[PDB]
Design a protein around this ligand. Structure first.
Ligand SMILES: CCCCCCCCCCCCCCCCCC(=O)OC[C@H](CO[C@@H]1O[C@H](CO[C@H]2O[C@H](CO)[C@H](O)[C@H](O)[C@H]2O)[C@H](O)[C@H](O)[C@H]1O)OC(=O)CCCCCCCCCCCCCCCCC
Ligand code: CLA
Ligand code: CLA
Ligand code: CLA
Ligand SMILES: CCCCCCCCCCCCCCCC(=O)OC[C@H](CO[C@@H]1O[C@H](CS(=O)(=O)O)[C@@H](O)[C@H](O)[C@H]1O)OC(=O)CCCCCCCCCCCCCCC
Ligand SMILES: CCCCCCCCCCCCCCCC(=O)OC[C@H](CO[C@@H]1O[C@H](CS(=O)(=O)O)[C@@H](O)[C@H](O)[C@H]1O)OC(=O)CCCCCCCCCCCCCCC
Ligand SMILES: CCCCCCCCCCCCCCCC(=O)OC[C@H](COP(=O)(O)OC[C@@H](O)CO)OC(=O)CCCCCCCCCCCCCCC
Ligand SMILES: CCCCCCCCCCCCCCCC(=O)OC[C@H](COP(=O)(O)OC[C@@H](O)CO)OC(=O)CCCCCCCCCCCCCCC
Ligand SMILES: CCCCCCCCCCCCCCCC(=O)OC[C@H](COP(=O)(O)OC[C@@H](O)CO)OC(=O)CCCCCCCCCCCCCCC
Ligand SMILES: CC1=C(/C=C/C(C)=C/C=C/C(C)=C/C=C/C=C(C)/C=C/C=C(C)/C=C/C2=C(C)CCCC2(C)C)C(C)(C)CCC1
Ligand SMILES: CC1=C(/C=C/C(C)=C\C=C/C(C)=C/C=C/C=C(C)/C=C/C=C(C)\C=C\C2=C(C)CCCC2(C)C)C(C)(C)CCC1
Ligand SMILES: CCCCCCCCCCCCO[C@@H]1O[C@H](CO)[C@@H](O[C@H]2O[C@H](CO)[C@@H](O)[C@H](O)[C@H]2O)[C@H](O)[C@H]1O
Ligand SMILES: [Cl-]
Ligand SMILES: [Cl-]
Ligand SMILES: [Fe+2]
Lengths: 38, 35, 51, 78, 39, 63, 30, 169, 341, 39, 53, 334, 32, 31, 39, 31
């Protein structure tokens, strides 16, 4: 466990938490509120 | 008539315009920096 | 001299362009095709093929 | 041919848009101004002020040469 | 003057056997003369 | 459609044309393995790049 | 002797031009 | 194969025209590639049955072909460690064997089959070309920067060795 | 209706700005690239990487601002904010040139996203995807110049800086060090770009001057209707005009428009191949036969040898300032120069 | 103005264009004063 | 390195060309001689989807 | 009826395979003269003392040039702007040594291209077309005139005209940058926008048309055979192309009027080239690109460099080496 | 000093004069 | 060996020119 | 096994314009690259 | 001039091989 290793794993975690799955959550939520009427 | 106010278009508009105006204020202020 | 020569060369060229524009347009308007080719009487259609 | 949203001419010719924006737009302008004029930009981005390009002990360009320890290098450059 | 189609034009043919014969001839001529071309 | 002995032997391998699993099938499993592969690729790139420095070796001809 | 090669390629290009103009496929309306 | 093009192996028995089961062919070829990769790593590169590979000192003065043992730690991901290459081929060959077995047995999701046009051989061509240019970029980079598989006694020194005065030092 | 299809519906809605699945990659990455460039050119210096002022905050103007390449000491480090160099310190990350890889990488992925958007929209509206195929040209240029060239070189420092004068510097650097003008692949690129501009001009003018009389106004723009079935200009008259003026002419509209695509795209691709060569210093720098003849015959002068001399002068005079990490010290007396100048 | 409840779009255009001209004039003025002015 | 970097670059275009030919096989010989309203702006809630408005 | 009328009917005939016209009666002789001389000189001309310092420069293939390095070399600096026809040389050898071929070729070429532009107008008039293709052509003509006539006039010598060769073109460009900083000249920036944008719009228009082609062929034959020469039906679906493009960027940024679209395609590169031609023509009078050398000073007064200073270093390096024996005095004024 | 101030006052009055003419004509119904 | 410097080009053309003549004629046959 | 005619075979075509275009392209490529081939 | 000894043969083949390809295809067209 080096500082660069720790920062790499932190980068994974913070990329997911900050970008990947607030964006997935928002996309799913809005797609399920505003729904196309067929 | 009676359109939504906030939209994806509203967000695309502001995402650009708002930092643009802030930056323009900054650059205006830059114009009066003295060395 | 630089200001005057540069400005007047640029103005001379753009007025040559304007001359070309208006001379071409004046000719086309006098001959009556400044608004496009008339489909009925498209001149090329009565012209023999080049080869 | 409209995809649903209000036309821009309609919005920007409305009174309410202007009541909102005659405030919001100048506020952002002067926030950017103040960001520069308080010196905050220099400190936030590390950009030298006109008197800090060179110091009384470093008269040359502070070119980074170190591959991993740039914080110390920058602080020694001042 | 007008450009009239010439009625004297005829197809040319080289059958596959003729192809093989000519290709062999060319190859063997090359084999023969290359040494002299290099000298 | 000429038959051959080797063709007959191989025939069951080329018989399931177009058959699929309905719906999404194993797509989630595939996606998780794709994510793991992407992480692995990032790791070895960053090592080669010297942006990820581990203990025990150096990226150098001396190793 | 490389001059010969340059002249050859230039002549080939010009000859292609002449044939493409003189012996072109006629545009035909049909 | 050009002359005897019309083999019944190639024709869909269900309907009667030529058809290839591309997912199944992938499973087969992937299983085979995994076998070959594992064998190359485990027998050739290790010298268990085979010559091994070229290894050299850091200064390219004593390069020769020897068996190489795999390196299973983090050091296996050091591009200048040949044991990394050996371990890669062993592990990636096992992974390829397992993946080929999965692809020999599990059919595509219908979603994937339609989205990726899995009945179209041109989809295979597209993804294969992608994989191939990925690999080509990788080999050009490892040649340019140097690594265990591009020793200087065989390919010459790198530009970065001159840049840094590696040999001078 | 599964959640995936509900998302697909929302993303592909007809709105002012189409999003699509490709938008998930395009918009955040394009925004990062653009905002990073604007932020760097407004606020961020190159004092520690290049010894240059490169932002409006320092007194530079539109022509002289840039997101400059990172310091040469970092090699090809990707320079993540959390990486071993900046170690999460945003200010240091700015000072070491982290914005350059930031902009470059987000731009590369935004370019990918944009081409994916071209594909997605083409698929949705039901047309052939030739716009994406055409956009592959700019992608090749960006990859070769902004990624491949510096990766072949010692570091990102020699990548082009994202600024007007930075680009001009890159251009002159390639002339002086690589003799890029002599490169046949650059020559094909030039031909493609100049031919594309020519085609654009000539086609636009030809169409505008063979229009059919479809209205009564002197303003011919209002005599078109997008749903009209018939040609709005006379292909026959255009063909006759160009056959008699130039000797040859297009007779096939489809071939004409394909050619208009093919020319500039092929040019971009060929010049990208040349840049890949330059990444490894594989230059078309010299003609050895003329070099040898000049070295033996002091009366032999061509424009080629003159250009060689210009390149020598540029390298010697520019290197100390352009490569400040090298600490090049060229005393005045070693600088090549002509008489009296 | 000429119609109640709304601004004419041309009035908005003139005002915004004057503001844009003003910011450009300020930048051009700044080219001659302060930092970057060669003095 | 030179040969393989150049070939990789060109194979990127090959990938794009063949992926597009795979995904757009149906329109390779041209677009449908209909194709009037599907592309019209604002008529459908989802671009292309005729079932939407 | 009369012999003159019959001749007039022949020259202005729209049935000639190549239109001649009254402008053609000047174009054809001058262009053939320029071409013949150019070919002969490029192949076989002896070296030319371009700088007027008795330092002749070999331009032709027979004197050791390849196609890339070969050129018709501009006339001597000793000549300057003087008219140097063949009959003003004591011998053909003298005329060649001083670069007479360059003047002959250039003057005839320029007459020819202006007559080409006039001829474009003339034929459009004879065919009942609209008259403005020649206006688009006036952009390349303007640029050619700038580099072969206007710049030498402003600089006072045909020796400073662009050489008629590949490497000579590059030499011209490098020296031009060293002396005028054309890269930092906004008119050249506009020319670059013109050509980059023209290529962009060429690619865009070609690709959108090709994308929206109506299905008329099979997957085996070329889709090009779907268009038949002289059909009125449109060969592509402009509404589908507009649908695609207005969704690629946004609806109101996409043309749906083909006439406005093609006007834009014509106008953009033409205007850009006019501007860059005017840039070269005004740098002919040494009104140069922007000079921001030492624009940024620190508070003490030390210069802080920018990319403009690095560019200036490159320019100085080019300048001090160019025409290495031609300068006697410290300022390159002429 | 005041030279830029006076200059800007003159400039602004001039800038308004034209649009003021147009706006007055539009609002009061004069011919345009 | 110091061979005639035109040997390779002469040999290549001596073979290639008639080869391509025959190839053209054969391939177009039946047109 | 029997030798059956393959029904997948299709004619190839190059029209005269394509011939001229390709010949010009080849000639201009030769013009471009010959100097470098000679070096 | 001391040029590359492969220059002539490379140039000749670079032109001739695609020339003959095009010629073959053109001539046989319509067969
Ligand atoms: C299609 C296009 C679609 C669009 C795609 C856009 C998205 C792209 C995302 C990918 C980003 C790639 C970043 C590559 C970073 C890199 O490479 O970084 C470089 C590193 C290697 O680091 C370099 O290594 C060099 C050599 O070092 C070696 O030698 C030295 C001297 O002997 C020392 O001994 C040193 O210790 C030893 O390691 C120097 O040290 C350099 O300073 C150092 O930067 O490679 C590595 O990380 C990895 C090497 C293997 C993979 C390389 C893939 C990319 C290769 C491109 C072609 C390369 C060259 C040809 C150019 C043409
Ligand atoms: C022949 C016309 C001409 C010439 C040679 C000059 C020359 C000069 N002027 Mg002047 N001026 C002019 C017309 C002219 N002016 C006009 C019409 C006005 C009214 C606006 C002014 C108002 C004016 C002021 C207030 C000042 C000058 C000043 C000066 C001096 C400094 C020049 C400078 O830096 O400007 C900078 C150069 C530019 C800004 C570039 C202009 C480029 C234009 C846009 C070219 C347009 C291109 C083309 C025509 C576009 C149309 C083509 C189309 C088809 C696309 C210089 C001697 C200065 C001075 O020193 O006073 C003593 C000064 O303060 N002038
Ligand atoms: C793709 C992986 C791969 C590659 C590229 C190589 C490459 C090589 N191996 Mg090898 N090896 C591998 C996998 C691989 N191996 C595996 C999986 C094993 C375990 C079985 C081995 C075990 C092994 C041994 C024991 C030896 C090698 C040797 C060699 C070298 C010479 C062999 C050769 O060139 O034959 C080239 C073959 C062809 C080009 C095809 C020939 C086909 C003929 C003409 C038809 C014959 C038909 C036949 C009768 C049925 C060569 C560098 C030899 C060596 O040490 O070299 C000095 C050696 O002794 N390998
Ligand atoms: C990322 C790559 C990149 C980008 C963004 C630019 C951008 C630019 N270049 Mg550059 N250039 C590049 C790479 C790049 N270049 C490379 C690799 C080379 C060769 C080394 C050059 C060589 C070069 C030269 C010599 C010149 C330029 C110039 C320019 C400017 C004019 C561009 C133009 O009109 O062309 C054509 C493009 C179009 C016609 C389409 C318009 C494109 C615009 C910019 C898109 C912007 C849209 C909008 C504003 C974005 C906001 C979103 C909106 C919703 C608000 C422009 C700012 C000129 C310049 O410096 O100007 C000052 C110039 O002289 N370039
Ligand atoms: C912020 C809104 C933008 C986010 C978005 O996706 O829309 C989310 C929608 C708004 O746009 C919605 O957007 C839809 C159009 S579109 O998706 O924006 O393209 C529209 O159908 C809907 O009526 C409209 O309410 O939800 C709202 O109505 C919330 C109003 C916002 C008030 C909080 C501040
Ligand atoms: C910044 C931008 C970021 C972009 C984010 C984009 C938003 C998310 C896009 C997701 C795209 C992939 C989903 C594909 C849909 C799918 O496969 O089936 C949809 C399934 C089937 O469900 C159910 O299944 C039922 C039956 S069936 O099996 O599907 O047929 C079916 O009836 C029903 O519809 C369904 O509910 O639904 C799911 O619940 C499975 C989720 C699996 C998604 C892949 C996860 C992998 C990503 C994680 C990465 C981290 C992993 C660890 C790394 C260290
Ligand atoms: C899976 C990959 C696909 C390739 C298959 C590789 C498996 C071969 C196993 C042989 C190595 C096992 C091994 O080490 O053998 C040892 C023997 C001689 O090895 P040496 O004595 O030189 O080396 C020391 C050995 O005793 C220790 O391995 O080599 C052989 O004779 C090969 C034996 C079978 C020959 C191949 C079998 C038939 C081919 C099919
Ligand atoms: C005006 C000057 C420019 C002239 C137009 C150039 C077009 C050349 C193409 C020639 C054939 C093309 C051709 O035949 O065109 C045809 C086109 C349509 O012709 P019409 O007959 O319909 O209209 C023209 C007259 O006949 C009736 O109005 O003409 C125009 O629309 C003229 C538009 C002028 C408006 C252009 C203004 C541009 C100003 C912007 C410049 C700024 C650039 C730098 C920015 C800083
Ligand atoms: C003033 C009259 C005298 C003209 C003399 C000037 C020659 C210009 C004649 C054009 C040459 C034909 C080349 C295309 C061969 C040809 O016949 O093309 C004919 C072709 C006609 O196209 P279509 O629409 O009929 O073809 C559609 C289908 O047949 C697709 O194949 O025209 C084009 O493709 C235009 C694009 C190429 C334009 C090429 C211009 C190249 C300029 C010259 C470059 C070489 C100079 C090297 C010097 C060493
Ligand atoms: C960096 C970074 C980031 C990002 C950011 C961003 C994304 C932002 C931004 C930004 C932006 C986005 C900004 C902006 C801007 C702008 C500007 C600066 C503008 C301008 C302009 C002008 C000047 C114009 C002018 C004109 C002209 C010239 C024409 C006509 C008139 C007018 C006026 C229009 C983050 C935080 C994530 C992280 C860290 C790094
Ligand atoms: C183009 C455009 C626009 C914009 C515009 C603008 C922005 C502006 C303007 C304008 C202006 C802003 C103006 C003005 C003017 C003024 C004038 C015209 C004046 C005058 C006068 C005079 C003549 C003066 C006189 C005098 C003298 C002589 C001295 C004594 C005093 C006095 C001052 C009285 C719009 C959006 C709308 C539309 C589209 C585009
Ligand atoms: C679509 C993908 C997008 C990728 C980009 C997304 C943004 C990525 C941001 C990741 C940033 C990582 O930022 C990193 O965070 C860690 C964890 O807090 C910080 O770490 C800090 O806190 C941790 C724990 O609190 C301590 O162990 C550590 O010593 C300290 O430095 C690092 O100093 C910083 O470098
Ligand atoms: Cl010179
Ligand atoms: Cl002098
Ligand atoms: Fe068109």
């Amino acid at each position: 466990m080096t500082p660069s290793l720790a920062n790499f794993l932190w980068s994974l975690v913070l990329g997911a938490a900050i970008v990947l799955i607030p964006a997935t959550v928002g996309l799913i939520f809005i797609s399920q509120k505003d729904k196309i009427t067929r | 008539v009676t359109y939504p106010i906030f939209t994806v278009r509203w967000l695309a508009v502001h995402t650009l315009a708002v930092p643009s105006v802030f930056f323009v204020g900054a650059i205006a202020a830059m114009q009066f920096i003295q060395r | 001299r630089a200001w005057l020569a540069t400005s007047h060369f640029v103005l001379g060229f753009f007025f040559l362009v304007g001359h070309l524009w208006h001379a071409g347009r004046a000719r086309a308007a006098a001959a009556g095709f400044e608004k496009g080719i008339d489909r009925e009487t498209e001149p090329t259609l009565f012209m023999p093929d080049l080869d | 041919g409209t995809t649903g949203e209000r036309p821009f001419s309609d919005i920007v010719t409305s009174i309410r848009y202007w009541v909102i924006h005659s405030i919001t737009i100048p506020m952002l302008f002067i926030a950017g101004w103040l960001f520069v004029s308080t010196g905050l930009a220099y400190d936030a981005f590390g950009t030298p002020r006109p008197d800090e390009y060179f110091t009384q002990t470093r008269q040359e360009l502070p070119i980074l040469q170190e591959r991993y320890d740039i914080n110390q290098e920058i602080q020694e450059f001042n | 003057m007008d450009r009239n189609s010439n009625p004297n034009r005829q197809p040319v043919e080289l059958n596959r056997t003729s192809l093989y014969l000519g290709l062999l001839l060319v190859a063997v001529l090359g084999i023969l003369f290359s040494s002299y071309f290099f000298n | 459609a000429q038959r051959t002995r080797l063709g007959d032997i191989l025939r069951p391998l080329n018989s399931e044309y177009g058959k699929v699993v309905p719906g999404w099938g194993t797509t989630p499993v595939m996606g998780v393995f794709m994510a793991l592969f992407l992480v692995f690729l990032l790791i070895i790139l960053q090592i080669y790049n010297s942006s990820l420095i581990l203990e025990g070796f150096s990226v150098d001809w001396a190793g | 002797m490389e001059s010969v090669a340059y002249i050859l390629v230039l002549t080939m290009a010009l000859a292609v031009l002449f044939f493409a103009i003189a012996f072109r496929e006629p545009p035909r309306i049909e | 194969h050009w002359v005897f093009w019309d083999l019944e192996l190639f024709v869909d028995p269900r309907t009667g025209e030529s058809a290839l089961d591309l997912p199944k062919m992938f499973g087969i070829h992937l299983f085979l590639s995994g076998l070959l990769c594992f064998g190359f790593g485990a027998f050739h590169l290790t010298g268990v049955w085979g010559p091994g590979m070229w290894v050299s000192d850091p200064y390219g003065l004593t390069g020769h072909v020897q068996p190489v043992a795999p390196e299973w730690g983090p050091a296996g991901f050091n591009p200048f460690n040949p044991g990394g290459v050996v371990a890669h081929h062993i592990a990636a060959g096992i992974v390829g064997i397992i993946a080929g077995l999965f692809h020999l047995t599990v059919r595509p999701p219908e979603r994937l089959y339609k989205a990726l046009r899995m009945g179209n051989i041109e989809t295979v061509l597209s993804s294969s070309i992608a994989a191939v240019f990925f690999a080509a970029f990788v080999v050009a980079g490892t040649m340019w920067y140097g690594n265990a598989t591009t020793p200087i006694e065989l390919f010459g020194p790198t530009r970065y060795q001159w840049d840094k005065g590696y040999f001078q030092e | 209706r599964g959640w995936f299809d509900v998302l697909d519906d929302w993303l592909k809605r007809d709105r002012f700005v189409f999003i699509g699945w490709s938008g998930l990659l395009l918009f955040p990455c394009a925004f990062m690239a653009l905002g990073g460039w604007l932020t760097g050119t407004t606020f961020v210096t190159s004092w520690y990487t290049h010894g240059l002022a490169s932002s409006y905050l320092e007194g530079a103007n539109f022509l002289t601002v840039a997101v400059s390449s990172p310091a040469d000491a970092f090699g090809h480090s990707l320079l993540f904010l959390w990486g071993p160099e900046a170690q999460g310190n945003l200010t240091r990350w700015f000072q070491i040139g982290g914005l350059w890889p930031f902009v470059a990488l987000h731009g590369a992925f935004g370019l990918i996203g944009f081409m994916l958007r071209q594909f997605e929209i083409s698929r949705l509206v039901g047309i052939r995807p030739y716009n994406a195929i055409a956009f592959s040209g700019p992608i090749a240029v960006f990859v070769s110049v902004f990624l491949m060239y510096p990766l072949g070189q010692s570091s990102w420092f020699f990548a082009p800086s994202f600024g007007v004068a930075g680009i001009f510097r890159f251009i002159l650097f390639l002339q002086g060090f690589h003799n890029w003008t002599l490169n046949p692949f650059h020559m094909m690129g030039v031909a493609g770009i100049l031919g594309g501009a020519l085609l654009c001009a000539i086609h636009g003018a030809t169409v505008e001057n063979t229009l059919f009389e479809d209205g009564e106004d002197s303003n011919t723009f209002r005599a078109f209707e997008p749903t009209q079935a018939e040609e709005t200009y006379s292909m026959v008259t255009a063909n006759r005009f160009w056959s008699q003026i130039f000797g040859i002419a297009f007779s096939n509209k489809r071939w004409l428009h394909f050619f208009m695509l093919f020319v500039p795209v092929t040019g971009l691709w060929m010049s990208s191949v040349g840049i890949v060569g330059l990444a490894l210093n594989l230059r078309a720098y010299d003609f050895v036969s003329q070099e040898l003849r000049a070295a033996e015959d002091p009366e032999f002068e061509t424009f080629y040898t003159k250009n060689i001399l210009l390149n020598e002068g540029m390298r010697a005079w520019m290197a100390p300032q352009d490569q400040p990490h090298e600490n090049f010290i060229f005393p005045e007396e070693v600088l090549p120069r002509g008489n009296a100048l | 103005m000429f119609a109640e409840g709304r601004i004419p779009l041309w009035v908005v255009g003139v005002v915004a264009g004057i503001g844009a001209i003003g910011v450009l004039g300020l930048f051009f003025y700044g080219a001659y004063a302060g930092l970057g002015s060669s003095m | 390195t030179f040969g393989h970097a150049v070939f990789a670059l060109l194979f990127f275009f090959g990938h794009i060309w063949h992926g597009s030919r795979t995904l757009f096989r149906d329109v390779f010989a041209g677009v449908d001689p209909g194709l009037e309203e599907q592309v019209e702006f604002g008529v459908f809630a989802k671009v292309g989807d005729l079932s939407t408005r | 009826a009369s012999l003159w009328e019959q001749f007039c009917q022949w020259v202005t005939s729209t049935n000639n395979r190549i239109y001649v016209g009254w402008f053609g009666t000047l174009m054809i002789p001058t262009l053939l003269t320029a071409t013949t001389c150019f070919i002969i000189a490029f192949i076989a001309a002896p070296p030319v003392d371009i700088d007027g310092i008795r330092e002749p420069v070999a331009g032709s293939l027979l004197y050791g040039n390849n196609i890339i390095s070969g050129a018709v070399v501009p006339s001597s600096n000793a000549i300057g702007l003087h008219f140097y026809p063949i009959w003003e040389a004591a011998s053909l050898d003298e005329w060649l040594y001083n670069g007479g071929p360059y003047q002959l070729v250039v003057f005839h070429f320029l007459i020819g291209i202006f007559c080409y532009m006039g001829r474009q107008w003339e034929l459009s008039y004879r065919l009942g077309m609209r008259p403005w293709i020649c206006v688009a052509y006036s952009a390349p003509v303007s640029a050619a005139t700038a580099v072969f006539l206007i710049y030498p006039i402003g600089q006072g010598s045909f020796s400073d005209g662009m050489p008629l060769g590949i490497s000579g073109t590059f030499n011209f460009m490098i020296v031009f940058q060293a002396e005028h900083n054309i890269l930092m000249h906004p008119f050249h920036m506009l020319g670059v926008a013109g050509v980059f944008g023209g290529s962009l719009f060429s690619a865009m228009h070609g690709s959108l048309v090709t994308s929206s082609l109506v299905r008329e062929t099979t997957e085996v034959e070329s889709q090009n055979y779907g268009y038949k020469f002289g059909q009125e039906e449109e060969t592509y679906n402009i509404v589908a192309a507009h649908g695609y493009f207005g969704r690629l960027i946004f609806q109101y940024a996409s043309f749906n009027n083909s006439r406005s679209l093609h006007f834009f395609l014509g106008a953009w590169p033409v205007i850009g080239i006019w501007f860059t031609a005017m840039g070269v023509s005004t740098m002919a009078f040494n009104l140069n690109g922007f000079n921001f050398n030492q624009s940024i000073l620190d508070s003490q007064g030390r210069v802080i460099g920018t990319w403009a200073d690095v560019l200036n270093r490159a320019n100085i390096g080019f300048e001090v080496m160019h025409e290495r024996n031609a300068h006697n005095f410290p300022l390159d004024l002429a | 000093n005041l030279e830029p101030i006076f200059q800007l006052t003159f400039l602004g009055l001039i800038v308004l004069a034209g649009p003021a003419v147009v706006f007055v004509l539009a609002f009061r119904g004069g011919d345009l | 060996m110091q061979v005639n410097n035109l040997g390779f080009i002469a040999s290549i053309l001596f073979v290639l020119v008639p080869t391509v003549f025959l190839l053209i004629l054969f391939i177009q046959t039946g047109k």
